[PDB]
Amino acid sequence: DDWEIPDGQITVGQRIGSGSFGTVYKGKWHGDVAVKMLNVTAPTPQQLQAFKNEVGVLRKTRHVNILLFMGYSTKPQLAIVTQWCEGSSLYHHLHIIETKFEMIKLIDIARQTAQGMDYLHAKSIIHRDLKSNNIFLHEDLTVKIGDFGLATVKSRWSLSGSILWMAPEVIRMQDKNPYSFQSDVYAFGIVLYELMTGQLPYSNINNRDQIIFMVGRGYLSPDLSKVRSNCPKAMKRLMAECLKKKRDERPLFPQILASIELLARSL
Numbered sequence: 691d692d693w694e695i696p697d698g699q700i701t702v703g704q705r706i707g708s709g710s711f712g713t714v715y716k717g718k719w720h721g722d723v724a725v726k727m728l729n730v731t732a733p734t735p736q737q738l739q740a741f742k743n744e745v746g747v748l749r750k751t752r753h754v755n756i757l758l759f760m761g762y763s764t765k766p767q768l769a770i771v772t773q774w775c776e777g778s779s780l781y782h783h784l785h786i787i788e789t790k791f792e793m794i795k796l797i798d799i800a801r802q803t804a805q806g807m808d809y810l811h812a813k814s815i816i817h818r819d820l821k822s823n824n825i826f827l828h829e830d831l832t833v834k835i836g837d838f839g840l841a842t843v844k845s846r847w848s849l850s851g852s853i854l855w856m857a858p859e860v861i862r863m864q865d866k867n868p869y870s871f872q873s874d875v876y877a878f879g880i881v882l883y884e885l886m887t888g889q890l891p892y893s894n895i896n897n898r899d900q901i902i903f904m905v906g907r908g909y910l911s912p913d914l915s916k917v918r919s920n921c922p923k924a925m926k927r928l929m930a931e932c933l934k935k936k937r938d939e940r941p942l943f944p945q946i947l948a949s950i951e952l953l954a955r956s957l
């Protein structure tokens with residue numbers, strides 16, 4: 691009935707995670723776990739009921755490509771415990787350790803992430819923050835998507851680091867709720883660009899606000915020409931489809947997924 695891990699059962703160890711939202715530690719609870727201790731004062735409802743409501747979102751997910759929610763902690767503090775992933779994140783592989791993936795593997799990472807996304811969308815979950823930092827490469831073979839949890843915690847107790855993945859309608863903080871299925875798709879288009887170019891977009895602009903203004907007004911978009919010349923002829927078009935400026939013109943993941951598997955049977 692309950693996934694509440696009682697006080698003293700978990701063993702928080704070496705610190706790895708940082709930033710806002712929360713702090714991420716490697717733990718030990720029935721083996722190596724990940725614990726995301728969202729450092730927030732000491733609630734007290736609504737907060738308690740709000741945390742438990744966000745946890746109930748995570749419980750809806752059971753998929754090889756979605757990070758395994760293992761349990762949550764309220765007692766020693768508020769926290770989410772998931773499986774620990776062996777290996778690095780996609781962002782780290784591509785942009786730090788500079789790992790050069792074989793073209794079939796790159797297509798596979800893409801296929802898998804799209805797969806994981808298709809699932810979330812089916813279970814009526816909008817990620818709201820798909821980026822290569824959040825795509826974990828487990829045992830260097832399985833794609834695990836994470837950080838989709840909370841976001842109500844992000845709004846009820848409160849946006850400066852995911853710029854590159856943000857779709858136009860999101861970038862320009864316009865109508866109250868810009869987040870959609872298609873919003874996640876553009877973000878996917880960006881991670882596709884990351885995969886196919888091994889680069890972050892807009893590296894030749896040094897002014898972040900300028901990126902923000904232009905992307906949001908659709909004057910500037912990712913440079914599709916930079917994809918390596920051994921890239922499939924039809925991968926470039928799928929990427930362009932996902933990155934459409936108007937959100938109405940973007941595919942959904944069932945369709946996206948079909949295109950990857952179609953071009954997969956071409957290598």
Ligand SMILES: CCCS(=O)(=O)Nc1ccc(F)c(N(C)c2ccc3ncn(C)c(=O)c3c2)c1F
Pocket residue numbers: 706707714715724725726748756757758759770771772773774775776777778826836837838839840
């Ligand atoms: C499944 C519910 C979605 S959620 O609750 O929104 N995301 C979520 C929850 C707890 C975490 F520790 C991590 N991360 C951040 C995490 C997890 C495992 C990791 N394993 C290894 N390494 C090196 C990590 O950095 C690492 C980070 C998450 F992304």
